[PDB]
């Protein structure tokens, strides 16, 4: 974690484009964010291009920390996002809730997948 001339790098973009949308992710960017810092999401294909601010950092256990934030120009009562990240396994889950749609991101070892929640399940009714 400790380094020089790079820890100061504070980019607002969380992940970058490269069933769903493949993205590249750096877990060190969010770990350098404190309560009040600005965070940006870019999902242009899904029509999402907006910024937000970290409002809550919560250790869920010794290994998992959850970041919670709200968007600057959404609906202040409903819209928000969460980034829950495990350190031991380089695994991060994101919940992005906007009025234009809901998006989930599952990331493992710097590579991840973002998709609309309708892609999250396909199944058939089960009978006896």
């Amino acid at each position: 974690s400790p380094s020089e001339k790079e820890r100061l790098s504070q980019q607002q973009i969380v992940f970058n484009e490269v069933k769903g949308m493949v993205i590249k992710y750096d877990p060190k960017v969010i770990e350098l964010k404190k309560v009040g810092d600005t965070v940006k999401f870019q999902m242009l294909e899904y029509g999402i291009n907006r910024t937000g601010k970290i409002v809550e950092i919560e250790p869920v256990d010794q290994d998992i920390v959850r970041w919670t934030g709200r968007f600057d120009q959404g609906d202040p009562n409903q819209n928000f996002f969460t980034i829950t990240q495990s350190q031991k396994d380089h695994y991060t889950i994101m919940q992005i809730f906007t009025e234009k749609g809901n998006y989930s991101a599952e990331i493992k070892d710097g590579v991840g997948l973002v998709q609309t929640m309708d892609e999250g399940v396909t199944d058939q009714e089960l009978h006896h």
Partner: protein, 573 residues
């Protein structure tokens, strides 16, 4: 004119600066998905984006004057922007069409361009303009008027017959959905009013979105919404004032405490067939896990209060608010090791345990239980742990639990999921379809289920499904209370779908009343699962206002509320 392209731009969509007249072209062999305009620029710089590629492109509009977040660029589109130093933004030059007959009704001819502008002037005016139906899917139109005499838009092919009147300064953006055959509003420029101008009441609305501001020097003590409006008209009430104000409950479909404090915001939406304003957005006072929690909870100053118990703010007993209005809600979450007792003036006396979510609602006869806790046993296959990691696999299921509780709370569903145990175990089965069957009798999972009194069990495996990545018995008894999804194709959003089946819900189109709501503008959990709601005729799409159900035919919440308590009592003390 200077011609550029991705291959001539390091294969990047960042349109470079320094050109007085630039043309960025996209082709099949020369294409990039995401594009953006340069921030640094001179005053009258011109940029034109053309595309002949089969793949669509998307333009960052954050430094333009287009209120949309992203522009969809298709083959044949020609977008032109001219910078402006006075506004520090790229001004768009859209294809403009205007009414030409000064008559009472005129159909507007639209081209096949993805984005067009309909502009009304003093010299190019019509009493009622109509957007054409059956145009290319995704066509976006900006309707703007600078005329001094007002006009309006024909409502036949509009999603809702709102008050789409056009005066000087009005601006409406519509996108056509061929799946609906309707023009759907995507951005509405709000009509801004200071409450000092209109007093304590608004007799009628004038536009689809009215925004009423409260502040210091601009303030009244109470405010009454109009008695009637057009379908899906919206009123936003905002305050920056020091002293609170009250939004009167008359004409509103809510008896809750509509107190307008500093920084608060309320949103209302009129529903013609019901004849009242629906409350679609209201503040929530949150006492989080780091803040001090009072032994007697404060009197309601907003429709909802959420209390977050932790080890550092733990309280032995909590008294529900002494003063409240019918419909007020209190949600209590606990991450402390010790229990907390909850009491009310009417004699209600209960406890909240570690990891439990509990909601209470106020009635004419005091506070009332509004949710039942369904204890769940989370089972993760060792195959999943090897792929994701031991901690990661637990993280995946927890996010599924949190999303289910969020969906249930948004839908007024009277249940929460609480994980009471997590075990690593492989159910003996070649397929996920087989695992949901034998898991009901598996000695390892059923003994652990009984040991921790789990009302249900959920399994996260890596076996291939027989035609799908999720399985769950519909309307499950205690014996059949089990659900499963994989990791190959299913995400953590599948849990709220499988648990919905366990609660007794079917997919959209089913003959049962407990079924999902499928809609191109957003589908509930059982009917497509792209918005955080279970279907109900008392819930509405937050952005578009579409009712998420139908009385007596599509109502998932009514079936959930009939089975939640029974399931919560499968295992008990």
């Amino acid at each position: 004119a200077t011609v550029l392209s991705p291959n001539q731009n390091n294969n990047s969509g960042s349109i470079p600066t320094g050109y007085s007249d630039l043309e960025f072209s996209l082709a099949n062999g020369n294409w990039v998905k995401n594009l953006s305009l340069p921030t640094n620029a001179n005053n009258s710089d011109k940029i034109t984006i053309r595309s002949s590629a089969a793949y669509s492109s998307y333009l960052d509009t954050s430094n333009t004057n287009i209120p949309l977040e992203v522009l969809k660029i298709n083959s044949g589109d020609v977008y032109q922007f001219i910078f402006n130093s006075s506004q520090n933004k790229w001004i768009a030059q859209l294809a403009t069409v205007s009414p030409t007959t000064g008559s009472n009704y005129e159909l507007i001819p639209l081209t096949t361009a993805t984005m067009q502008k309909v502009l009304i002037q003093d010299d190019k005016w019509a009493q009622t303009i109509a957007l054409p139906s059956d145009v290319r899917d995704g066509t976006t139109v900006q309707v703007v008027s600078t005329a001094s005499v007002s006009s309006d838009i024909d409502k036949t092919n509009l999603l809702f017959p709102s008050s789409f009147t056009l005066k000087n300064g009005s601006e409406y953006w519509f996108k056509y959905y061929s799946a609906l055959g309707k023009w759907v509003p995507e951005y509405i420029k709000p009509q801004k009013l200071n409450v000092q101008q209109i007093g304590t009441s608004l007799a009628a609305v004038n536009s689809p979105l009215t925004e009423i501001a409260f502040g210091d020097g601009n303030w009244v003590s109470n405010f009454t919404l109009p008695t009637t409006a057009n379908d899906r008209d919206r009123i936003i009430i905002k305050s920056t004032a020091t002293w609170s104000a009250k939004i009167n409950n008359t004409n509103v479909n809510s008896q809750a405490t509509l107190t307008l404090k500093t920084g608060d915001q309320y949103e209302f939406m009129y529903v013609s067939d019901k004849g009242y304003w629906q409350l679609i957005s209201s503040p929530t006072k949150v006492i989080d896990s780091t803040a001090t929690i009072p032994a007697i909870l404060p009197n309601m100053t907003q429709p909802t209060l959420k209390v977050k118990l932790s080890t550092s703010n733990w309280q032995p007993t909590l008294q529900l608010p002494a003063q409240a209005q019918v419909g007020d809600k209190v949600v209590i979450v606990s991450n402390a090791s010790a229990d907390t007792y909850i009491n009310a003036a009417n004699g209600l006396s209960t406890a909240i345990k570690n990891g439990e979510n509990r909601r209470f609602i106020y009635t004419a006869q005091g506070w009332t239980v509004d949710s039942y806790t369904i204890d769940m046993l989370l089972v993760s296959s060792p195959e999943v742990n090897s792929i994701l990691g031991e901690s990661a696999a637990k993280l995946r299921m927890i996010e599924g639990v949190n999303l289910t509780n969020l969906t249930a709370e948004n839908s007024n569903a009277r249940f929460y999921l609480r994980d009471v145990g997590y075990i690593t175990y492989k159910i003996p089965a070649a397929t996920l379809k087989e695992a949901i069957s034998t898991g009901r009798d598996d000695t390892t999972v059923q003994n652990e289920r009984k040991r921790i009194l789990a009302d249900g069990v959920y399994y996260q495996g890596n076996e291939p499904g027989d035609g799908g990545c999720g399985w769950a018995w519909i309307n499950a008894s205690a014996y059949n209370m089990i659900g499963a999804n994989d990791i190959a194709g299913c995400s953590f959003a599948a849990m709220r779908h499988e648990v919905g089946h366990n609660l007794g819900l079917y997919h959209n189109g089913s003959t049962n009343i407990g079924s999902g709501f499928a809609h191109p503008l957003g589908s509930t959990a059982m009917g497509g699962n792209n918005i955080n709601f279970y279907s109900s005729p008392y819930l509405y799409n937050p952005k578009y206002g579409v009712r998420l159900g139908e009385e007596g035919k599509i109502d998932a919440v009514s079936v959930i509320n009939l089975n939640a308590q029974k399931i919560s009592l499968y295992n008990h003390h």
